[PDB]
Design a protein around this ligand. Structure first.
Ligand SMILES: *[C@@H]1O[C@H](CO)[C@@H](O[C@@H]2O[C@H](CO)[C@@H](O)[C@H](O)[C@H]2NC(C)=O)[C@H](O)[C@H]1NC(C)=O
Ligand SMILES: *[C@@H]1O[C@H](CO)[C@@H](O[C@@H]2O[C@H](CO)[C@@H](O)[C@H](O)[C@H]2NC(C)=O)[C@H](O)[C@H]1NC(C)=O
Ligand SMILES: *[C@@H]1O[C@H](CO)[C@@H](O[C@@H]2O[C@H](CO)[C@@H](O)[C@H](O)[C@H]2NC(C)=O)[C@H](O)[C@H]1NC(C)=O
Ligand SMILES: *[C@@H]1O[C@H](CO)[C@@H](O[C@@H]2O[C@H](CO)[C@@H](O)[C@H](O)[C@H]2NC(C)=O)[C@H](O)[C@H]1NC(C)=O
Ligand SMILES: CCCCCCCCCCCCCCCCCC(=O)O
Ligand SMILES: *[C@@H]1O[C@H](CO)[C@@H](O)[C@H](O)[C@H]1NC(C)=O
Ligand SMILES: *[C@@H]1O[C@H](CO)[C@@H](O)[C@H](O)[C@H]1NC(C)=O
Ligand SMILES: *[C@@H]1O[C@H](CO)[C@@H](O)[C@H](O)[C@H]1NC(C)=O
Ligand SMILES: *[C@@H]1O[C@H](CO)[C@@H](O)[C@H](O)[C@H]1NC(C)=O
Ligand SMILES: *[C@@H]1O[C@H](CO)[C@@H](O)[C@H](O)[C@H]1NC(C)=O
Ligand SMILES: *[C@@H]1O[C@H](CO)[C@@H](O)[C@H](O)[C@H]1NC(C)=O
Ligand SMILES: *[C@@H]1O[C@H](CO)[C@@H](O)[C@H](O)[C@H]1NC(C)=O
Lengths: 49, 175, 198, 99
């Protein structure tokens, strides 16, 4: 609140602060289970374009 | 110079070094034909307000269209012509039939015209009735004195409060 | 008249819907204001053909029949002193066509999407409401605003008013002609102030 | 301001985000045509009514309050005199009972 008012003194009253945040703990990734590698050779390393 | 509009002859006189012409806004209101060296006036083709008169659509699906800036009394600039055409100071009204009677305003079309759903039901357009006619039996030697009274109770509703709100500006804008 | 800009505006979003909501609210509010001010009486009272109002002359605030719109003499001056734009809400595409758009301001406002809607009440109908109010306050006094109109001679109405301002009703009767002359002169002075230049 | 008619009293009632007033008013209902006069000559002197109005039921004259027909006899205690009656307009001759 003091930062919001840009002052070090808050007069008596009630003030509205930021809504309740919860910071995430984990960081997940979900990609399809694919093991094959893209045909880089056939597209970039192929004769007879 | 691309664009879209109507082209007509103009009384404007363009100097040799002038090709296009502009208006109070920045908009090409005139142009010179390179092949014929004649002036032309560009006018936008879209012009005129359109208002739709409809009931709740839970009661009937037919509507009436009011075309402002159209005088049918004079290929009118209308989407679709209809059998029932009524001319009003607001504009041409299509889809509503004029009735010579006067009722209270149900749908405020315009100047003094109000529509309603009535009667095989159909949409009607009528001149609004200000109220019942009356005359006071005035005379220099006549007065009216009540002999009885009525106690009437009337309700007056007045808003006093409005919903209080608060916004977290870093949760709406950013999240 | 651009398809590309319109298809971009569809993406930019719908703020024009709320703009139009606000403007429609304003227009309906104007109609409501007119109704609230003038439509205070539903019974339309006609002035009696006989005009024996104790010497008072209301021929300059009451309607004059010999006009297309039944309007008074001190309302025609007011109308002629306020100059509306074109005094009409029908400007056909033909009239605006032919290099009259850049000249006429209304045509420019109207080729660019801006329109002026007509009010729900015509000037003649507002004048009818006012004439009803004048007839009621003349013939009946303040009774028509409390219910059914009750006729009363105008002199006695003015006597009641004098009693209201703490003056005995005898003063009016003993000085009726003087008061009527003062009132008529004062109502002519309003005409002079309005029919003159100011 | 407080309902239609002569205001007697009002009763507040609460509504969501607003208030409701029940305006009790006094509305006269039944009116009767009468014949009236601003004053009356009794002995060459004009009589005016104090808090009232003169009316005639025909052959007889009375005085009553404006907002309700409560006819009464015309008396000196019910009227006040002011000068002769060569200046008033519409005055009518009649007797003023002296209690
Ligand atoms: C009320 O006033 C108007 C004008 O102030 C009077 O109209 C005049 O009438 C006489 C004829 O009686 C004409 O000669 C005048 O030219 C009129 N003046 C106007 C129209 O401005 C009217 O007569 C008055 N009413 C009464 C009952 O006397
Ligand atoms: C009270 O005022 C009135 C006017 O407001 C006076 O009446 C005027 O009297 C003069 C002469 O004194 C006349 O020339 C005017 O024509 C009168 N005017 C009107 C409208 O009648 C009056 O004299 C004043 N005195 C009394 C006692 O009434
Ligand atoms: C009301 O009474 C007055 C007198 O108080 C009457 O007026 C007088 O009438 C007599 C008879 O005609 C005359 O001789 C007097 O000169 C009058 N005096 C005045 C001051 O006017 C009057 O006529 C009576 N009203 C009626 C209707 O009879
Ligand atoms: C007007 O009122 C008078 C009263 O002042 C009426 O005359 C009275 O009528 C009643 C009813 O019959 C009698 O009892 C009285 O004796 C009458 N008066 C006198 C003085 O005797 C009169 O009838 C009324 N007229 C109308 C048309 O209502
Ligand atoms: C051969 C087909 C692969 C297609 C995969 C989908 C596209 C994903 C982006 C791949 C871009 C690779 C471009 C080369 C990367 C830069 C190499 C370099 O700079 O030496
Ligand atoms: C593919 O790449 C290898 C080395 O990365 C190269 O020796 C070979 O010639 C390439 N294939 C073709 C068809 O050129
Ligand atoms: C060619 O254009 C000129 C104007 O620049 C015009 O005078 C002439 O008639 C045109 N000729 C043809 C064949 O269109
Ligand atoms: C409005 O729609 C509901 C649901 O279909 C229906 O029950 C109701 O009768 C409708 N009202 C009118 C006036 O048609
Ligand atoms: C419509 O045009 C007719 C002539 O065709 C004219 O008499 C009438 O006054 C016009 N009405 C309006 C409202 O412009
Ligand atoms: C209604 O009025 C029009 C003229 O405005 C007239 O032609 C028509 O006959 C009238 N109809 C009725 C039923 O009064
Ligand atoms: C008074 O008399 C007139 C006709 O003289 C009549 O039209 C009117 O209805 C009467 N008023 C009352 C309240 O009876
Ligand atoms: C009332 O007017 C009539 C004419 O309608 C007239 O004969 C009578 O003398 C007038 N009376 C008063 C008091 O003005």
């Amino acid at each position: 609140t003091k930062c919001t008012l840009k002052s070090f003194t808050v007069e008596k009253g009630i003030y509205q602060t930021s809504n309740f945040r919860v910071q995430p703990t984990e960081s997940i990734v979900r990609f399809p289970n694919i093991t094959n590698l893209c045909p880089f050779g056939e597209v970039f390393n192929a004769t007879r374009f | 110079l691309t664009g879209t509009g109507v082209l007509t002859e103009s009384n404007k006189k363009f100097l040799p070094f002038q090709q296009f012409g502009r208006d109070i806004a920045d908009t090409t209101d005139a142009v010179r034909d390179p092949q014929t060296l004649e002036i032309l006036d560009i006018t936008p083709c879209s012009f005129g307000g359109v208002s739709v008169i409809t009931p709740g659509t839970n009661t009937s699906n037919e509507v009436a269209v009011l075309y402002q800036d159209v005088n049918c009394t004079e290929t009118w600039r209308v989407y679709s012509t209809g059998s029932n055409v009524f001319q009003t100071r607001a504009g041409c009204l299509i889809g509503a039939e004029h009735v010579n009677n006067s009722y209270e305003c149900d749908i405020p079309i315009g100047a003094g015209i109000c529509a309603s759903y009535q009667t095989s039901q159909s949409i009607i357009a009528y001149t609004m009735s200000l109220g019942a006619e009356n005359s006071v039996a005035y005379s220099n030697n006549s007065i009216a004195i009540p002999t009885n009274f009525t106690i009437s109770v009337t309700t007056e509703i007045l808003p006093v409060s409005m919903t209080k709100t608060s916004v977290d500006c870093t949760m709406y804008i950013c999240g | 008249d651009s398809t590309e800009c319109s298809n971009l505006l569809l993406q930019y979003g719908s703020f024009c819907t709320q703009l139009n909501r606000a403007l429609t609210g304003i227009a309906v509010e104007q109609d409501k204001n007119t109704q609230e001010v003038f439509a205070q009486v539903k019974q339309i009272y006609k002035t009696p053909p006989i005009k024996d109002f104790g010497g008072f002359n209301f021929s300059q605030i009451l309607p004059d029949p010999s006009k297309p719109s039944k309007r008074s003499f001190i309302e025609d001056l007011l109308f002629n002193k306020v100059t509306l734009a074109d005094a009409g809400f029908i400007k056909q595409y033909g009239d605006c066509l032919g290099d009259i758009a850049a000249r006429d301001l209304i045509c420019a406002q109207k080729f660019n999407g801006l329109t002026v809607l007509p009010p729900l009440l015509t000037d003649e109908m507002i004048a009818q409401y006012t004439s009803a109010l004048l007839a009621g306050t003349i013939t009946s006094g303040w009774t028509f605003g409390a219910g059914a109109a009750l006729q009363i001679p105008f002199a006695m109405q003015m006597a009641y008013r004098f009693n209201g301002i703490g003056v005995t009703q005898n003063v009016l009767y003993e000085n009726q002609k003087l008061i009527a002359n003062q009132f008529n002169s004062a109502i002519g002075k309003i005409q002079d102030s309005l029919s003159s230049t100011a | 301001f407080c309902g239609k008619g002569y205001h007697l009293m009002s009763f507040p009632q609460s509504a969501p985000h607003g208030v409701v007033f029940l305006h009790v008013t006094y509305v006269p209902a039944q009116e009767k045509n009468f014949t009236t006069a601003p004053a009356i000559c009794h002995d060459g002197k004009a009589h005016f009514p104090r808090e009232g109005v003169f009316v005639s039921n025909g052959t007889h004259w009375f005085v009553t309050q404006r907002n309700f027909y409560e006819p009464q006899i015309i008396t000196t205690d019910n009227t006040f005199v002011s000068g002769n009656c060569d200046v008033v307009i519409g005055i009518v001759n009649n007797t003023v009972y002296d209690p």
